[PDB]
Amino acid sequence: KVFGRCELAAAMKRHGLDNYRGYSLGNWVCAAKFESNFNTQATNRNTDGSTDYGILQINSRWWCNDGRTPGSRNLCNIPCSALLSSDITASVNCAKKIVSDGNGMNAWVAWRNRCKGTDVQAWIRGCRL
């Protein structure tokens, strides 16, 4: 499923991401825009053999099980395919645990390079929340 901008902001707000651990809603929408282009089915392969899954591109090295990343852990206790659903609950819950492990949203390379320090507020401007 390819979300609309305001559609995904409303979905993330209902699932508790607005000001989660100090990050306004504009940060999460901005990260999803540049990590996945709002597409829940996005996958990308990393040079170490691991794969990023979903609208926030969560890594199989630490967070989910896909059965082909030997030596990895499964700290979100889910199969990686559950992160490709049109229902974003699984990806939101796993993202809450990631942003809490000390390093914040810096774990998302695209947020660091393209959203941090910008007016993230503009990503939710005009939406009914």
Curated annotation (Swiss-Prot):
Q: In which tissues is it expressed?
A: In the egg white and polymorphonuclear leukocytes.
Write out the GO biological process terms: cell wall macromolecule catabolic process; defense response to bacterium; defense response to Gram-negative bacterium; defense response to Gram-positive bacterium; killing of cells of another organism
Task: Tell me the protein's name.
Answer: Lysozyme C
- Give residue ranges for domain C-type lysozyme: 1-129
CDD domains per the UniProt record, alphabetical: LYZ_C
For the keyword Nucleus, the answer is no
Enzyme Commission designation = 3.2.1.17
Class of the enzyme per the UniProt entry, highest EC level? hydrolase
- What is annotated as the active site? 35, 52
SUPFAM superfamilies cross-referenced by the UniProt entry: Lysozyme-like (SSF53955)
**What is the stated purpose of this protein?**
Lysozymes have primarily a bacteriolytic function; those in tissues and body fluids are associated with the monocyte-macrophage system and enhance the activity of immunoagents. Has bacteriolytic activity against M.luteus.
Query: What lineage, starting at the top, does this entry show?
Result: Eukaryota, Metazoa, Chordata, Craniata, Vertebrata
